[PDB]
């Protein structure tokens, strides 16, 4: 427990040191003077402030945190800014939900929630009332996020932090300029479009204000109106003299020529309501709600209902249907009808729909269903399927044939009906050929929309838009599809889309899966409704009654990052003094044009030229954005809008378009979904309190470098804490006994081995950092680094070398610094370094000798084998025999393997061909049993450690390697003497079975 607290103590000390030193603050006026190795601009999509930051946010931003930590050692100057996204409706929604209980009840409120979740966050009874207003959220949560992040030690220039609502004047002016330019370039358009709409909120319901179906969009249905004829059914007697229609939903209008009846569910609650011209429609409450928000009613969102009934109350009614050859068709029941899809009313196409002929045959079979629901013989019997569409492999009556073949006799055969449905599922879309007059011999794909238009023009059909999948909003409202007027960004313009496609070609995606995601969302995207009326954000500068949603004021704010330090100077809300003395309102459209457009003319403003030139310098220096890391959930929405807006804002400058975007999966905690409802959920401040910042960052580095879901394990973090504490204690011990270390020329065998292993680790870890594979970087630059050091300490019989251990400590610290900068800074000052580790450079690797490394692996294997043989037959004297060359039979088989390897670019044939060729060689008579195990071992070690096992002699001196460590071998084996001999001296068994690299031994 005290180790975590020691880590936290060191962390707080070093954090205060960094703050006073002002190390991570960068200025373009000064950095542009000393040309170094370039700039590195990383961004994290600023998070929503409707709560505290948790572990997923920190895992996602850890990518660019470690990236800055590494890239600064390679000489570049880094810009890691951090904003806070307050725009949106959840903040205001929760504030108003809190005010609801504040005003309708008391403090505390009497029940029979929001106050409970606020108190669960540890707020005082008297301090939750202040949260009835959103401004208190804006004053409360952003400072806590900043505090936690600073406590994590992010290499962030906090002077460039800001807030995103109109409360911030500077960001407000920035978004004003952005959308003014967008509308000036014909990117924003006012129009009436279809959109997922929240009735309780009164505005479109986009991706980040939903709770179910993150990307689900509307779906189109052909809505047939079947007129009800007199004599009306009983329940509709009160609606005499008016026009009554059954509104059936369908997805295949071209089939309506073969209608025989109409299916309703007898146990469903159907609603008859009045439309815009006074007619009466019969559907369900949800269908009517959607139609009312699609202009089907006199008032938007008002459904004047004039009758409620059950499906049984409609059975037997007489209908007149379009297109069909039957002049009067009847309403009949069907048991299997979904209440989530359509209008609850289905048309009957018995020729090409399996469910229809199934239900019709069930009604034609027994009088039980006809008398249970009141169906006489005129409503079912004189109705036969009508040939309309012919599939070549089935005929004019496809459903009839495939349901006679699958031997179905009921409408409740879910499996058989699903199979018959999928068999002819799409074979009607393309290969169908019409048969009715006016369309004989036509491709169904070539006539379906024409017949739909035919029915819509004659007033016999309409267009009904319903959510494809069920959608739920943040405010617990079930959304509809509304055809409403709004301002939208025109992401469907072919020119804009092709330019963004080129930008995607130029963009760096660390895997092809993300490129495919981008291609799909680029081919699928169209108009994007961007206007809200309820919530926080920035108003349209010309339509002050509309606000701008959260997914649209966040497209090019990275440009605002480059000047936020000179505009508002660290004060989040932008309410403090300006460092350059620029008033919040003084930033006009032309001023922003001059700042962000290189070829823009200097306008007439009271601002001095030096200030605006400094701003333009900052922008043109820091741009473009090199890297942007995020979760794979922001690819279908935010990142595509980001590419689009960068293309539209700087259309002549592809060099200002984003460079790279790295996406990761979502974080699991202890291999389980992280959620507050299940128990496992860590916020950033909780995680720091529990594991220290460096321990948390270490366990975060090992989480996951793929796009598959990442795994944060607590036990791994605890083990990392233990290892960090032991490492710091080891460093302290070594600094204490500086004079107890061997010095001079480091010439011993293990000195050279360890030098080469250290350099190879430097090279491998540099590589793994370049690929942002931080798990592999931690593997090669810490765990395996420490394993090499432990082997070096264990094998150094004459004690470790002074300069070599100093170099190992220096380099291990320089490698670990991007993961654990606090511990590394502390150990840096422990070594007596003059400057901070934040000024260091990436360590230079020396020469790497593969022969030494392979020999050390050999010695490891030999020692493991010796200790395993020590298990059985009190020992005191051992003798090892080492073969200088392979014995004759082994040499012959290995020469055959070498020949075959040389034949075809290093592929060894099947052991069958090998055994044949070796059984054809006369010398190999006494050895055919021993042959194939040799080939098996050779293939295993070829797959394991390269083709070097095909060498006829080891690349290094085997006996000399053993002699360099005879002392250690004798000590660790608890023996008195070890005799290393050249195999030729041994007896017959050993001399015959010994081979180089596999030396034998006997006690
Ligand atoms: C896929 C089989 O659909 C076919 C297949 C062949 C033919 Cl010829 C047709 C249809 B289809 O009937 C409607 C509509 O198109 C189709 C809509 O599919 P989805 O399950 O609601 O997603 O199901 C039917 N449907 C619509 N609402 C329904 C509901 N609430 N319950 C059950 N079925 C419904 O139109 C014609 C005449 N029936
Ligand atoms: C620019 C604007 C339109 C974006 C908007 N402000 C926003 O999205 N704010 S946010 O707090 O929900 O997320 C911000 C970043 O943190 C990642 N992330 C979030 N949760 C998890 C998780 N459970 N697991 C893994 N990563 C996660 C997420 O992808 C994103 O890059």
Author numbering: 7 to 118, 156 to 916, 932 to 1061
Task: Copy the relevant paper text.
We were able to obtain a co-crystal structure of hcLRS bound with a tavaborole derivative, a previous reported anti-cryptosporidium benzoxaborole, AN6426 (37). The structure was refined to 3.0 Å resolution. The IC50 of AN6426 to hcLRS in vitro is 7.7 μM. In the structure, AN6426-AMP is well accommodated in the editing pocket with the AN6426 moiety mainly binding to residues from the editing active site, such as Thr293, Thr298 and Asp399. The side chain of Lys 464 from the I4ae insertion is within the Van der Waals interaction distance with the ether group at the meta-C of AN6426. Structurally, this I4ae insertion makes the size of editing pocket from hcLRS much smaller than those from bacteria LRSs. One could imagine that if we added a bigger group to the meta-C of AN6426, this group will clash with the I4ae insertion of hcLRS. So it is theoretically feasible to design benzoxaborole-based derivatives with larger groups that will target bacteria LRSs but are too big for hcLRS. Taken together, our results showed that it is feasible to design benzoxaborole-based derivatives targeting specifically LRS from bacterial microbes but not hcLRS.
